[PDB]
């Protein structure tokens, strides 16, 4: 008997049950919704999808009009449309947290074990026809197929939007705190198991490389000086596991809690200028603080950098993506008249949407020459010979590539695309339509409809067969941009919702914690308040070089 | 130089921090109050305080008037008033946690590291000249003269309210599931990590003792059968560590899931009737279910017994300690409109709190013969002999001791209370009138104030040297009860918070579990819905025996 719930029978977030052999109830508890799918509407419900603007057009709204915006920027109206922001998309995900790869329902077991991944939608039940339900071919295209006719990048098209390398580079560095996949234990686990900021891509995963890795005097990290300017330490100084090619001497390794920011030049020089700003705020506290132990600066200064970094990720990291007029506002009292959860953990679909390599360049551009990728990944030596400032200028202004659209994947990390949608097929997750349905979007009708074009959705009407049997990253990949837009819309109405829940969920935010006592004192909570990217690099460093998430345009 | 904190400046909740060398700062962020010691009021907080009743005068109204309350309990305010009661004392207790038994301070490792527990007051800083801060002597009373003295049971006095022995162990049994401090890390330590009612005391730490427990068909655990009633199995068949007399045959012990329930009869007796409850709810799944693995209904059943646990803890267990008119109520939804985070933390306080050894007997009567302790305690056969229906009856007849007072713990367990003093004082914890007053009471002023009485009193004031030395667990103990009830106030004020706070911090209590489908649809929800003690015991059994937290009184 066919597995009623690979229908989806379920409408608005009702949950799948199977009872007998072939039967299923739709639980619609607080859906807002009735009936056996739940389709039919609450009174109020009801009032608000007839006045529910398209999400196109409030993107229409916040990309448009700036004489509106700076008024609205000048007054408290600011404030109240962030609160919005803030709260109707946080409500989308689920907290607690419901599912994981090894359960589609709630459990104690899927609550407890955090080293899963959790999960927004339930898996595609085994037992159907379909490996996407029940649409689709009975086996569903090939992987570097798609990858490569459809995501290889062919000429470099830029990001319209004016992002840069010094941007990418921060999503990477900020996106591997909380995105470790253990390959170990398989897919959908995690060896990052705080799911959030809480920088342990900066101090470890756990408490073994944190002590391994600080000075433990005035609440300091250990570090070198080459060159008269300061630097990660060594494994021979501070010994723990990171991953490194088998030939280099130990003497060039460097140690930052992160075990692969040793490969890309980009990520090391994050975990410098990071470090570099832990051990300042830590002679900071020192300043007023004579009387504290080694371990109470060291987690003062931890909650002072998570502090500023959700702060620098809500103002000018979503910022730069999201092209809004409307200046963001990272204040956590905004929610304190809410109903939130101050936890997140982290979902199959946030990291597999993240997967942003289309942000690489063909080549990696420093000064008046240029480096290949065979030349720029895992060099040892080109952090330290070019200054942290050098880097962040040639970064911040070198352009990124546009995420969306499709056929902009660099050829050389293609590969990474291609994993990525066979561990979908591993992990199971649900067609696009259905992902498109949850986050409040309409699922597309045909191909052509979801790329704005003719060929490639022709093409991938001859693949997939049917649109509600796209997958999740690919279609998210091949999506039409929004106009002069970084990329079309799931990315946005699926990527916000984890983004906001996963930075003011951070118990920092929270009322408890959200105190100067937390911080220090005043000037660690005002270090915090006043946080931005400059203040990170040229605080840290002899000069300021151009740091932007844009190019000088 | 003195530690300015440990003249407690800081009022009302503030954070005393300190600057300078003999600076402090009181953080008074939220605590409704200003100034330098959070001493001024704010408009509200004034006109709260002004119109705030008596501990004692609420429990005036809350135990008197049963016609008054009649009408409440037959209307809607009895689901208000409920409501007020949840959320009132929850919000004394910090969520997201704060201390720890190695923080005076907030910290991303005291948020992170659960193997701790919590902490609702810092500790006394180390450098001030007394241990309890400033006041007292220099070095503070003999433990076990306290505890031989003040503590030691000379009569029996019998609980006023009714509480029984079926009561006292299921306090015991319920408690260890969240109350498992590890001599092997130390004081302020736990192995069970779930900090609430995740039933860690039925199915285990960890997930190795759950899968050598659980029988891996139809959802069910594994189980002897003796006389032809059904027991949990022996370590021969599902081998998992539990310590035991290092004598008795293998096929005697029996496998539960809290290591030390082998002891006494009374915790395997309610982890026998658990189990009997957890394999039948498996079955009516099952009936329902056809479809569904293994795995699924174990946790769908864990969810219920869960549920059932928090049902049955509040309506009868808090109940019969609280001697109101008023009708708790468990009902999740009472806090769908309050900002309430559902994540609980176990705090030292509580554990220390709840050590309520009084309510054992001098010794242990069943049917027409009496056991002693050294008959009672370790017996391996006693729960087999009787039937289950024995033990139940027996335990439910014979009166549990009264908590409050003094002089009535047994001279058998009186070791564990002084210990918990010496533990105690490793823990650092402040003076019991700054818990009381962190519990929106007033500091005595006197002994004679807090026993009710002169000759405790003046002895008390001789060992001390002052009341605000006066240390928590004892004074705890000492403390006058109120007219007829089971012990004083503080407890009342103090433990009310932690229990309400653990008990509906759970996940299963939030909007987003709190449905009938994680609960494999309404049977079990209601299963859930509908839970008390005689249904838990009757259920399982072949017949029914006077199953009750009270006596026949
Ligand atoms: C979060 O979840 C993950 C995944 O659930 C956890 O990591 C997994 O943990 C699993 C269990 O700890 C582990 O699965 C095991 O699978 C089998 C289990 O079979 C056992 O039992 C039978 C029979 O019973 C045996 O018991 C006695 C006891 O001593 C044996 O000697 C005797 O031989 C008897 O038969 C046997 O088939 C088997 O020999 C096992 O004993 C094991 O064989 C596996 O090796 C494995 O241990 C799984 O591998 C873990 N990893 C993954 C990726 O799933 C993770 O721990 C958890 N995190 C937290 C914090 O809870
Ligand atoms: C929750 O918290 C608890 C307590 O914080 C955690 O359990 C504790 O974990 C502690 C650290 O893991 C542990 O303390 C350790 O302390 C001594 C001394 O520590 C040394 O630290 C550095 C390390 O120097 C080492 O360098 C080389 C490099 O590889 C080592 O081999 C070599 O052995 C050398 O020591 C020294 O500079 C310093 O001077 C100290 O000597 C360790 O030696 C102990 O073995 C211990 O591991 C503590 O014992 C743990 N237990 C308790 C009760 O505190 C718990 O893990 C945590 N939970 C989570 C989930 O994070
Ligand atoms: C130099 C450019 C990059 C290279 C070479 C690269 C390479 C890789 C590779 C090889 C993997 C496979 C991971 C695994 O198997 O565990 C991977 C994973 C990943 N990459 Fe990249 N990547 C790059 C840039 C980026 C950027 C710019 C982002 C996003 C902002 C990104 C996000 C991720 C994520 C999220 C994962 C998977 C996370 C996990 O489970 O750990 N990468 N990357
Ligand atoms: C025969 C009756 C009882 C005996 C022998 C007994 C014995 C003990 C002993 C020996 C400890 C030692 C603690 C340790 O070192 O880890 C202990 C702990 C404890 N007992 Fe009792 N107890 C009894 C009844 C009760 C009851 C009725 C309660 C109800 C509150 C209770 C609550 C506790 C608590 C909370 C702990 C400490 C928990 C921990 O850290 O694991 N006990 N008990
Ligand atoms: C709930 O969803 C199911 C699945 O989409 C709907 O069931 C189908 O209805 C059509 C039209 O009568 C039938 O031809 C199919 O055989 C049904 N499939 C199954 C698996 O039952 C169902 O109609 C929906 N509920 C309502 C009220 O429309
Ligand atoms: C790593 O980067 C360094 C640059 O910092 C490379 O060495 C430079 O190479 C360019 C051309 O490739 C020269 O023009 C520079 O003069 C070199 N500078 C130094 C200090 O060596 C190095 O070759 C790179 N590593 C790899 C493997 O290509
Ligand atoms: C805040 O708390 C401190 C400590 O209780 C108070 O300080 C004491 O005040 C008396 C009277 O002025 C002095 O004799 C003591 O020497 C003070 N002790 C210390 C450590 O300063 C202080 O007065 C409180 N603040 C206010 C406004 O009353
Ligand atoms: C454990 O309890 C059993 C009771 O079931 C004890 O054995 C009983 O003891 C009483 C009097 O002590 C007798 O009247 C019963 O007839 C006995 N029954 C059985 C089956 O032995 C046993 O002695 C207790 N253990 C200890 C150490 O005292
Ligand atoms: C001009 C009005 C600004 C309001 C800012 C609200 C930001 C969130 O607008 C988004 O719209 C989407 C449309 O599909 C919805 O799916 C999301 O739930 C909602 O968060
Ligand atoms: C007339 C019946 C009143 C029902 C409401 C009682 C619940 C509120 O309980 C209150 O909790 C506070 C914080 O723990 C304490 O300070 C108060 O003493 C206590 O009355
Ligand atoms: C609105 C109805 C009010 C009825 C008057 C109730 C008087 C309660 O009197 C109470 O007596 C207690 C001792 O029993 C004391 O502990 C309390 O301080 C006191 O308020
Ligand atoms: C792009 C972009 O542009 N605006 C964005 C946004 C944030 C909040 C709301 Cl509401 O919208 C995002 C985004 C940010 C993070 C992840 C995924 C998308
Ligand atoms: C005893 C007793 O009596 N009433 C109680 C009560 C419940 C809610 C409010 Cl408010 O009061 C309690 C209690 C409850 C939990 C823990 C410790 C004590």
Known sequence: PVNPCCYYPCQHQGICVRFGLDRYQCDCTRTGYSGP???????????????????????FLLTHGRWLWDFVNATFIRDTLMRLVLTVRSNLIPSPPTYNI?????????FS??????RILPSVPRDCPTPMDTKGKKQLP??????????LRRK???????????????????????????????????????????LGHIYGDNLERQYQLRLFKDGKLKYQMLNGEVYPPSVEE??????????????????????????????????????????RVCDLLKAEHPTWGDEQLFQTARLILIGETI????????????????????????????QFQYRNRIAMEFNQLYHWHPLMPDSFRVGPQDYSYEQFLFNTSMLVDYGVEALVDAFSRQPAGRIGGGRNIDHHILHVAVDVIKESRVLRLQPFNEYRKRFGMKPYTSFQELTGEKEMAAELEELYGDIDALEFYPGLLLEKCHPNSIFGESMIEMGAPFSLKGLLGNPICSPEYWKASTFGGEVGFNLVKTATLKK?????????????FHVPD
């Open 37 to 59: 799918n739940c389709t039919i509407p609450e009174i109020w419900t009801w009032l608000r999808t007839t006045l529910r603007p398209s999400p196109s057009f409030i993107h």
């Open 102 to 110: 090894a359960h589609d329902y709630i459990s104690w077991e899927s």
């Open 113 to 118: 074990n955090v080293s899963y991944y959790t």
């Open 142 to 151: 090939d992987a570097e197929f798609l990858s490569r006719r459809f995501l």
């Open 156 to 198: 470099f098209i830029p990001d319209p939007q004016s992002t840069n390398l010094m941007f990418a580079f921060f999503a990477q560095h900020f996106t591997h705190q909380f995105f470790k996949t253990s390959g170990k234990m398989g897919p959908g686990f995690t060896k990052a198991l705080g799911h959030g900021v809480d």
């Open 238 to 279: 501070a010994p723990v596991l990171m991953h490194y090619p088998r030939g280099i001497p130990p003497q060039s390794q460097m140690a930052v809690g992160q075990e692969v920011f040793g490969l890309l030049p980009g990520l090391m020089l994050y975990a410098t200028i990071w470090l570099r700003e832990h051990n």
């Open 311 to 338: 702060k620098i990720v809500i103002e000018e990291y979503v910022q730069q993506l999201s092209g809004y007029f409307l200046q963001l506002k990272f204040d956590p009292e905004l929610l304190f008249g809410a």
């Open 536 to 548: 990170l690099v040229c605080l840290n460093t002899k000069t300021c070089p151009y740091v932007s």
